[PDB]
Swiss-Prot record:
Expressed in brain, heart, kidney, liver, pancreas, placenta and skeletal muscle. The keyword Transmembrane does not apply. This is DNA cross-link repair 1A protein. It comes from the Eukaryota. The chain holds residues 700 to 1040 of 1040 of the full protein. May be required for DNA interstrand cross-link repair. Also required for checkpoint mediated cell cycle arrest in early prophase in response to mitotic spindle poisons. Possesses beta-lactamase activity, catalyzing the hydrolysis of penicillin G and nitrocefin. Exhibits no activity towards other beta-lactam antibiotic classes including cephalosporins (cefotaxime) and carbapenems (imipenem). It is found in: Nucleus. GO terms for biological process: cell division; double-strand break repair via nonhomologous end joining; interstrand cross-link repair. Induction: During mitosis. The mRNA encoding this protein contains an internal ribosome entry site (IRES) in its 5'-UTR. This 5'-UTR generally suppresses translation while specifically promoting expression during mitosis, when cap-dependent translation may be impaired. One of its GO terms (molecular function) is damaged DNA binding.
Length: 341
Protein backbone atom coordinates (compact mmCIF):
# COMPACT_ATOMS: atom_id res chain seq x y z
CA UNK A 1 0.00 0.00 0.00
CA UNK A 2 1.04 3.60 -0.65
CA UNK A 3 3.28 5.19 2.00
CA UNK A 4 2.09 8.40 3.66
CA UNK A 5 5.13 10.34 2.42
CA UNK A 6 3.89 9.90 -1.25
CA UNK A 7 0.51 11.49 -0.52
CA UNK A 8 -0.17 15.30 -0.65
CA UNK A 9 -2.74 16.21 2.15
CA UNK A 10 -5.83 18.15 1.08
CA UNK A 11 -5.57 17.08 -2.51
CA UNK A 12 -6.36 14.14 -4.69
CA UNK A 13 -2.59 13.94 -5.51
CA UNK A 14 0.20 11.39 -5.28
CA UNK A 15 3.91 11.74 -6.12
CA UNK A 16 6.03 8.92 -7.61
CA UNK A 17 3.33 6.34 -6.62
CA UNK A 18 2.78 4.05 -9.68
CA UNK A 19 3.54 0.61 -8.09
CA UNK A 20 0.59 0.37 -5.70
CA UNK A 21 -2.24 -0.17 -8.23
CA UNK A 22 -5.18 2.22 -8.00
CA UNK A 23 -4.56 4.49 -5.04
CA UNK A 24 -7.73 5.24 -3.16
CA UNK A 25 -8.89 8.76 -3.83
CA UNK A 26 -6.04 9.66 -6.17
CA UNK A 27 -7.31 11.82 -9.06
CA UNK A 28 -3.87 12.85 -10.49
CA UNK A 29 -0.48 11.05 -10.38
CA UNK A 30 2.64 13.24 -10.50
CA UNK A 31 6.06 11.87 -11.66
CA UNK A 32 9.13 13.93 -10.59
CA UNK A 33 11.63 12.15 -12.96
CA UNK A 34 12.32 9.15 -15.15
CA UNK A 35 14.22 6.83 -12.74
CA UNK A 36 12.90 3.25 -12.26
CA UNK A 37 12.37 3.45 -8.43
CA UNK A 38 10.04 6.38 -9.13
CA UNK A 39 8.20 5.30 -12.32
CA UNK A 40 7.89 1.56 -11.43
CA UNK A 41 4.41 0.51 -12.52
CA UNK A 42 3.77 2.77 -15.55
CA UNK A 43 3.07 1.17 -19.02
CA UNK A 44 0.86 1.49 -22.12
CA UNK A 45 -2.12 0.26 -19.98
CA UNK A 46 -2.07 3.16 -17.47
CA UNK A 47 -5.24 5.33 -18.01
CA UNK A 48 -5.07 7.94 -15.19
CA UNK A 49 -3.75 11.51 -15.77
CA UNK A 50 0.09 11.78 -15.27
CA UNK A 51 1.60 15.21 -14.67
CA UNK A 52 5.32 15.73 -15.37
CA UNK A 53 7.93 17.79 -17.27
CA UNK A 54 8.12 17.85 -21.10
CA UNK A 55 11.28 15.70 -21.08
CA UNK A 56 9.75 13.14 -18.72
CA UNK A 57 6.62 13.10 -20.98
CA UNK A 58 8.86 12.30 -24.01
CA UNK A 59 10.36 9.35 -22.18
CA UNK A 60 6.92 8.04 -21.00
CA UNK A 61 5.58 8.13 -24.62
CA UNK A 62 8.65 6.66 -26.32
CA UNK A 63 10.20 4.29 -23.81
CA UNK A 64 7.26 2.98 -21.80
CA UNK A 65 4.59 3.54 -24.56
CA UNK A 66 2.22 5.47 -22.32
CA UNK A 67 -0.57 6.84 -24.46
CA UNK A 68 -0.34 10.49 -25.29
CA UNK A 69 -3.92 11.34 -24.08
CA UNK A 70 -2.93 10.50 -20.47
CA UNK A 71 0.37 12.50 -20.49
CA UNK A 72 0.08 16.04 -19.18
CA UNK A 73 3.44 17.84 -19.58
CA UNK A 74 3.83 21.23 -17.81
CA UNK A 75 6.27 24.08 -18.57
CA UNK A 76 8.74 24.89 -15.83
CA UNK A 77 8.63 28.03 -13.69
CA UNK A 78 4.97 28.62 -14.66
CA UNK A 79 1.87 28.77 -12.41
CA UNK A 80 -0.54 26.06 -13.63
CA UNK A 81 -3.98 24.80 -12.34
CA UNK A 82 -4.49 21.07 -11.85
CA UNK A 83 -7.86 19.77 -10.65
CA UNK A 84 -8.46 23.10 -9.03
CA UNK A 85 -5.08 23.48 -7.30
CA UNK A 86 -2.22 25.84 -8.34
CA UNK A 87 1.10 24.01 -8.95
CA UNK A 88 4.55 25.03 -10.17
CA UNK A 89 7.36 22.70 -11.50
CA UNK A 90 10.95 23.85 -10.69
CA UNK A 91 14.31 22.48 -11.90
CA UNK A 92 15.64 19.87 -9.45
CA UNK A 93 19.34 19.81 -10.59
CA UNK A 94 19.05 15.95 -10.77
CA UNK A 95 18.87 14.15 -14.19
CA UNK A 96 17.31 15.62 -17.37
CA UNK A 97 13.67 16.42 -16.88
CA UNK A 98 13.76 16.13 -13.10
CA UNK A 99 11.53 18.52 -11.16
CA UNK A 100 10.55 19.74 -7.64
CA UNK A 101 6.77 20.46 -7.24
CA UNK A 102 5.22 23.39 -5.38
CA UNK A 103 1.54 22.88 -4.33
CA UNK A 104 -0.61 25.85 -3.19
CA UNK A 105 -3.44 24.29 -1.20
CA UNK A 106 -6.89 25.83 -1.16
CA UNK A 107 -6.69 26.43 2.62
CA UNK A 108 -3.43 28.50 2.23
CA UNK A 109 -0.84 25.79 3.04
CA UNK A 110 2.15 25.70 0.68
CA UNK A 111 3.99 22.34 0.19
CA UNK A 112 7.35 21.76 -1.68
CA UNK A 113 8.15 18.14 -2.77
CA UNK A 114 11.80 18.07 -3.90
CA UNK A 115 11.59 14.75 -5.76
CA UNK A 116 15.27 13.73 -6.08
CA UNK A 117 17.49 16.88 -6.09
CA UNK A 118 20.96 18.36 -5.72
CA UNK A 119 20.44 21.52 -3.74
CA UNK A 120 22.12 24.66 -5.12
CA UNK A 121 22.13 28.39 -4.19
CA UNK A 122 20.61 29.08 -7.62
CA UNK A 123 17.39 27.70 -6.22
CA UNK A 124 17.27 30.60 -3.70
CA UNK A 125 16.31 32.76 -6.76
CA UNK A 126 13.45 30.84 -8.36
CA UNK A 127 9.71 31.20 -7.48
CA UNK A 128 10.68 29.76 -4.06
CA UNK A 129 11.95 33.12 -2.90
CA UNK A 130 8.45 34.72 -3.18
CA UNK A 131 6.50 32.85 -0.42
CA UNK A 132 6.61 30.79 2.69
CA UNK A 133 6.60 26.94 2.66
CA UNK A 134 4.91 25.15 5.45
CA UNK A 135 5.79 21.52 4.63
CA UNK A 136 8.92 20.12 2.83
CA UNK A 137 9.00 16.56 1.45
CA UNK A 138 12.80 16.24 1.32
CA UNK A 139 15.28 13.99 -0.59
CA UNK A 140 17.41 12.89 2.36
CA UNK A 141 19.66 10.39 0.39
CA UNK A 142 22.92 11.74 1.87
CA UNK A 143 21.59 13.22 5.14
CA UNK A 144 24.71 12.57 7.31
CA UNK A 145 27.87 14.69 7.68
CA UNK A 146 30.23 12.01 6.34
CA UNK A 147 28.77 12.66 2.88
CA UNK A 148 30.98 15.35 1.36
CA UNK A 149 31.71 15.43 -2.32
CA UNK A 150 33.33 17.80 -4.80
CA UNK A 151 31.40 20.07 -7.22
CA UNK A 152 30.28 18.55 -10.50
CA UNK A 153 32.58 21.07 -12.24
CA UNK A 154 35.77 19.74 -10.42
CA UNK A 155 34.84 16.15 -11.16
CA UNK A 156 34.39 16.91 -14.89
CA UNK A 157 37.71 18.81 -14.96
CA UNK A 158 39.42 15.69 -13.51
CA UNK A 159 37.75 13.37 -16.07
CA UNK A 160 38.54 15.60 -19.13
CA UNK A 161 42.21 16.06 -18.15
CA UNK A 162 42.66 12.33 -17.40
CA UNK A 163 41.11 11.15 -20.71
CA UNK A 164 42.88 13.89 -22.81
CA UNK A 165 46.28 12.89 -21.23
CA UNK A 166 45.79 9.14 -21.75
CA UNK A 167 44.67 9.31 -25.37
CA UNK A 168 47.36 11.89 -26.30
CA UNK A 169 50.01 9.52 -24.90
CA UNK A 170 48.40 6.55 -26.64
CA UNK A 171 46.17 7.25 -29.68
CA UNK A 172 45.12 3.64 -29.68
CA UNK A 173 43.50 3.83 -26.17
CA UNK A 174 39.62 3.48 -25.99
CA UNK A 175 37.68 5.40 -23.31
CA UNK A 176 34.61 3.60 -21.84
CA UNK A 177 31.92 5.18 -19.62
CA UNK A 178 29.39 3.20 -17.60
CA UNK A 179 25.64 4.10 -17.42
CA UNK A 180 22.38 2.52 -16.11
CA UNK A 181 19.83 5.24 -16.17
CA UNK A 182 19.53 8.78 -17.51
CA UNK A 183 21.63 11.37 -15.60
CA UNK A 184 25.36 12.17 -15.54
CA UNK A 185 25.47 12.73 -19.32
CA UNK A 186 28.06 15.51 -18.82
CA UNK A 187 30.67 12.84 -17.97
CA UNK A 188 30.74 11.14 -21.37
CA UNK A 189 29.78 14.26 -23.39
CA UNK A 190 32.65 16.39 -21.92
CA UNK A 191 35.21 13.61 -22.61
CA UNK A 192 34.02 13.14 -26.24
CA UNK A 193 34.17 16.96 -26.80
CA UNK A 194 37.83 17.21 -25.62
CA UNK A 195 38.87 14.21 -27.76
CA UNK A 196 36.96 15.39 -30.88
CA UNK A 197 34.95 12.13 -31.06
CA UNK A 198 31.23 11.23 -30.83
CA UNK A 199 30.00 8.95 -28.10
CA UNK A 200 29.12 5.51 -29.37
CA UNK A 201 26.28 3.51 -27.82
CA UNK A 202 23.50 0.95 -28.34
CA UNK A 203 20.43 1.86 -30.36
CA UNK A 204 18.30 1.66 -27.13
CA UNK A 205 20.51 4.20 -25.35
CA UNK A 206 20.72 6.52 -28.40
CA UNK A 207 16.82 6.51 -28.49
CA UNK A 208 16.70 7.42 -24.76
CA UNK A 209 19.10 10.34 -25.28
CA UNK A 210 17.07 11.64 -28.31
CA UNK A 211 14.10 12.07 -25.94
CA UNK A 212 16.04 14.62 -23.76
CA UNK A 213 16.09 18.01 -25.72
CA UNK A 214 19.87 18.26 -25.27
CA UNK A 215 20.96 20.90 -27.87
CA UNK A 216 23.31 19.73 -30.57
CA UNK A 217 22.94 16.09 -29.53
CA UNK A 218 22.98 14.74 -33.08
CA UNK A 219 26.45 16.42 -32.98
CA UNK A 220 27.77 14.42 -29.94
CA UNK A 221 26.25 10.92 -29.98
CA UNK A 222 26.10 8.01 -32.46
CA UNK A 223 25.27 4.34 -32.94
CA UNK A 224 28.40 3.73 -35.07
CA UNK A 225 30.82 2.34 -32.54
CA UNK A 226 33.54 1.99 -35.19
CA UNK A 227 33.78 5.71 -35.76
CA UNK A 228 33.89 6.54 -32.01
CA UNK A 229 36.67 6.40 -29.37
CA UNK A 230 34.39 7.03 -26.40
CA UNK A 231 31.97 4.06 -25.84
CA UNK A 232 29.05 3.83 -23.40
CA UNK A 233 28.32 0.44 -21.82
CA UNK A 234 25.97 -0.82 -19.07
CA UNK A 235 27.35 -0.13 -15.61
CA UNK A 236 27.49 -3.88 -14.90
CA UNK A 237 30.03 -4.40 -17.68
CA UNK A 238 32.54 -1.87 -16.03
CA UNK A 239 34.86 -4.55 -14.56
CA UNK A 240 38.04 -6.23 -15.80
CA UNK A 241 36.22 -9.23 -17.38
CA UNK A 242 33.54 -7.14 -19.07
CA UNK A 243 36.09 -4.72 -20.46
CA UNK A 244 38.60 -7.42 -21.65
CA UNK A 245 35.62 -8.83 -23.64
CA UNK A 246 34.65 -5.50 -25.12
CA UNK A 247 38.24 -4.84 -26.19
CA UNK A 248 38.27 -8.20 -28.06
CA UNK A 249 35.20 -7.01 -29.95
CA UNK A 250 36.96 -3.95 -31.32
CA UNK A 251 39.09 -6.08 -33.67
CA UNK A 252 42.52 -4.68 -32.86
CA UNK A 253 41.60 -1.03 -33.33
CA UNK A 254 42.58 -0.48 -29.68
CA UNK A 255 45.17 -1.85 -27.26
CA UNK A 256 44.20 -0.17 -23.96
CA UNK A 257 40.98 0.86 -22.10
CA UNK A 258 40.56 3.72 -19.67
CA UNK A 259 37.08 3.35 -18.06
CA UNK A 260 34.98 5.61 -15.83
CA UNK A 261 32.35 4.54 -13.20
CA UNK A 262 30.47 7.67 -12.04
CA UNK A 263 29.27 6.59 -8.55
CA UNK A 264 27.30 8.76 -6.03
CA UNK A 265 29.47 8.48 -2.87
CA UNK A 266 32.23 6.09 -1.88
CA UNK A 267 34.24 6.29 1.53
CA UNK A 268 37.40 7.26 -0.41
CA UNK A 269 35.71 10.79 -0.12
CA UNK A 270 36.30 11.03 3.68
CA UNK A 271 40.07 10.70 3.11
CA UNK A 272 40.91 11.63 -0.48
CA UNK A 273 40.61 14.90 -2.55
CA UNK A 274 39.51 14.61 -6.25
CA UNK A 275 43.06 15.56 -7.28
CA UNK A 276 44.30 12.45 -5.42
CA UNK A 277 42.00 9.82 -7.09
CA UNK A 278 43.74 6.82 -8.68
CA UNK A 279 42.47 3.90 -10.74
CA UNK A 280 42.35 0.16 -10.29
CA UNK A 281 44.55 -1.29 -13.05
CA UNK A 282 44.98 -4.81 -14.47
CA UNK A 283 47.11 -5.28 -17.56
CA UNK A 284 46.06 -2.69 -20.16
CA UNK A 285 42.75 -1.84 -18.37
CA UNK A 286 42.31 0.97 -15.86
CA UNK A 287 39.03 1.81 -13.97
CA UNK A 288 38.37 5.10 -12.26
CA UNK A 289 35.49 5.53 -9.71
CA UNK A 290 34.61 9.25 -9.83
CA UNK A 291 32.23 10.90 -7.22
CA UNK A 292 29.85 12.56 -9.66
CA UNK A 293 26.67 13.10 -7.54
CA UNK A 294 23.16 14.15 -8.66
CA UNK A 295 22.00 14.35 -5.01
CA UNK A 296 22.71 16.98 -2.30
CA UNK A 297 25.76 16.58 -0.13
CA UNK A 298 25.02 17.01 3.59
CA UNK A 299 26.19 20.62 3.65
CA UNK A 300 24.23 21.56 0.47
CA UNK A 301 21.05 19.99 1.95
CA UNK A 302 21.58 21.80 5.25
CA UNK A 303 22.08 25.19 3.56
CA UNK A 304 18.86 24.79 1.52
CA UNK A 305 16.67 23.87 4.44
CA UNK A 306 18.16 26.64 6.74
CA UNK A 307 17.37 29.14 3.82
CA UNK A 308 13.80 27.79 3.24
CA UNK A 309 12.87 27.57 6.97
CA UNK A 310 9.98 25.04 6.63
CA UNK A 311 7.61 24.44 9.54
CA UNK A 312 7.65 20.64 9.05
CA UNK A 313 10.08 18.30 7.19
CA UNK A 314 8.98 14.85 5.87
CA UNK A 315 11.96 12.72 4.70
CA UNK A 316 11.41 10.62 1.52
CA UNK A 317 14.68 8.54 1.60
CA UNK A 318 16.27 6.30 4.33
CA UNK A 319 12.81 6.05 6.03
CA UNK A 320 12.85 2.30 6.49
CA UNK A 321 14.94 1.98 9.74
CA UNK A 322 14.33 3.51 13.17
CA UNK A 323 18.05 4.37 13.56
CA UNK A 324 18.05 6.28 10.22
CA UNK A 325 14.86 8.12 10.94
CA UNK A 326 16.09 9.14 14.46
CA UNK A 327 19.45 10.32 13.05
CA UNK A 328 17.72 12.51 10.44
CA UNK A 329 15.26 14.02 12.96
CA UNK A 330 18.22 14.93 15.17
CA UNK A 331 19.93 16.77 12.31
CA UNK A 332 16.69 18.62 11.42
CA UNK A 333 16.48 19.92 15.09
CA UNK A 334 20.12 21.02 15.01
CA UNK A 335 19.55 22.95 11.80
CA UNK A 336 16.47 24.70 13.16
CA UNK A 337 18.20 25.66 16.46
CA UNK A 338 21.34 26.94 14.77
CA UNK A 339 19.30 29.06 12.27
CA UNK A 340 16.71 30.25 14.81
CA UNK A 341 13.43 29.39 13.01
NI1 LIG B 1 16.62 9.66 -9.03
Amino acid sequence: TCPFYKKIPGTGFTVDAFQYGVVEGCTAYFLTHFHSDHYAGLSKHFTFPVYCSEITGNLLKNKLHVQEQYIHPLPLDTECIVNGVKVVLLDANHCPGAVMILFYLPNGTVILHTGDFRADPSMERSLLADQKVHMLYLDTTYCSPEYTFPSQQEVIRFAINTAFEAVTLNPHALVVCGTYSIGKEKVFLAIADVLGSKVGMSQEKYKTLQCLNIPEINSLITTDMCSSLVHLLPMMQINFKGLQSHLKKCGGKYNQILAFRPTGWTHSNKFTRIADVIPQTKGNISIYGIPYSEHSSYLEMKRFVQWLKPQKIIPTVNVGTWKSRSTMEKYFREWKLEAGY
